[PDB]
Write a protein that binds this ligand. Sequence first.
Ligand SMILES: Cc1ccncc1NC(=O)[C@@H](C)OC(F)F
Ligand SMILES: Cc1ccncc1NC(=O)[C@@H](C)OC(F)F
Lengths: 304, 304
Amino acid sequence: SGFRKMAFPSGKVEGCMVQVTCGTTTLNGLWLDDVVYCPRHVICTSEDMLNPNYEDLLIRKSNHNFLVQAGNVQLRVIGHSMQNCVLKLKVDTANPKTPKYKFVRIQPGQTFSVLACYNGSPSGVYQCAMRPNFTIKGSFLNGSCGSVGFNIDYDCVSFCYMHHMELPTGVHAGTDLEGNFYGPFVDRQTAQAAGTDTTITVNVLAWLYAAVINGDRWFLNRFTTTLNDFNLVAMKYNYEPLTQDHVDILGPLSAQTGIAVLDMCASLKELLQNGMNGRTILGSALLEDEFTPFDVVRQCSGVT
Amino acid sequence: SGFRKMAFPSGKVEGCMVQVTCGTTTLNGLWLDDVVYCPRHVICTSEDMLNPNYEDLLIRKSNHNFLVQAGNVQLRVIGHSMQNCVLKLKVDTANPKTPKYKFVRIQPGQTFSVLACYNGSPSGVYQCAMRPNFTIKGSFLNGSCGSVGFNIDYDCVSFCYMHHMELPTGVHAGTDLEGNFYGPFVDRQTAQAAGTDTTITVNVLAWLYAAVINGDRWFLNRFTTTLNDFNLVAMKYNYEPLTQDHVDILGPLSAQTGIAVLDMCASLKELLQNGMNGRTILGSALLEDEFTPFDVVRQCSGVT
Ligand SMILES: Cc1ccncc1NC(=O)[C@@H](C)OC(F)F
Ligand SMILES: Cc1ccncc1NC(=O)[C@@H](C)OC(F)F
């Protein structure tokens, strides 16, 4: 009973967080095996960020200029390299707490947990989604860079995000663990406007299924629709177009509840056209889009 | 930038989770030092829950009937005792992962993180509040009992909740770590209706301050009110009465933003009387009450 915005247990990731300092800049690093991964803007001063030439700034840095501290003990840096927008600091000690891990590049609409950190220390964990405009709506203050996003499948941590930037609009941008930014964002203090933040339709439908499973059913109606008809409404409301791949992914939830995907699409269509009328669904007064169909199945079944 | 429903990093608590089995019932235990704490209804079969006599059911159980497994290794039970609604299983090995800890009994309106577990294994972490009717709105399926709620102050984990029951209305009830239920709930499968779920006024005001700090300011108005005037409106909307103690606790947020507590109360009064008018605050279309003023300061400052 009950449905919550749940993050993955963060222990496996907490054991990887380190502090990285270069000159006067301090941010977070991710220590896996004998490598520490961190944003390359650790080599920048606040003034360098306006127009940084990372290759030129890196020439002035040696291994001893990157101070890496894991808790209260210092790690010895024996090598450094820049891969896209991340720095890889080879250290002389493999992290004894390294979990089984993978680096994945997620698609927009996919969810992940963030372990927000400051100075190598974890402050909290929350669940968010990669928006269709490749931004995330996080909670990051100065010093949180290098905090990571991840998913966990049993004992394997799939790292998908590393925090780099706060856009002037208060939204966040970052990279995968190969240092490639999600979206068109760059690690420069310049005008970078995000595109339309459209709603993740397949996730809203997954969340409506979770609501039916947990008892909130008022929004179920006597109607059905087609993909093309639903999509005309979705376009009008800045919702992502629903495809047959999305319908297929909702198959298990449709099977468990006995509510055809297109019937749920018709419930969603009426909610878009008529609003909630002062009512709530799973404690929310708007349509939630940060639960994937996989998240709904996982939570509704008790996967550990 | 940004404000999220953030849970504490769960690592320190993950290291304490064990599985406890008695007969055919399996739930979660909390292993601290050489004691494993778990709900006493681990000794019950589903049929026993209708009218259990815990003292009588416990007489038929010996140390060897409580199977405690931490990961893949079995713990030897050398003693057992019932304290209120929890069982304390003395084991022969102190948990090497025992963090610095305290057992606290929280007040309604206070928030905490829950590490949802099944079979001694963590599934996820979320933040919730002890409701004014002493229930929590969690996400717990069968097998989640013994999952705990906690707060963390630097390196000390303050355990405040242990999950025991799902009320027929889908809300949750449990105990503190001394085994005393929050509210009037009992560990019996019987009619237990919750009282009015009133809104935690001081937390809504704290969250309005967080919204102003993060840029959402549309709801600020040209009005002020008094405690008695605000409280007439609060009564009408099932909001908890605001006291001078609540005003005092909001002092730091009032000082940081320059918005007097009574002016914020007047903004809240207009939001209650006029609604949001299709608008949102911090991504929510309703007034959020599960952030305490301490949570807002912590998140807005970067406490680790
Ligand atoms: C302040 C802040 C708050 C939260 N996240 C990141 C940042 N920091 C940045 O965006 C820096 C790295 O770039 C800036 F130079 F444009
Ligand atoms: C099913 C379930 C789901 C989530 N939490 C707890 C329970 N379980 C109970 O409430 C049991 C312990 O009492 C019942 F007998 F009244």
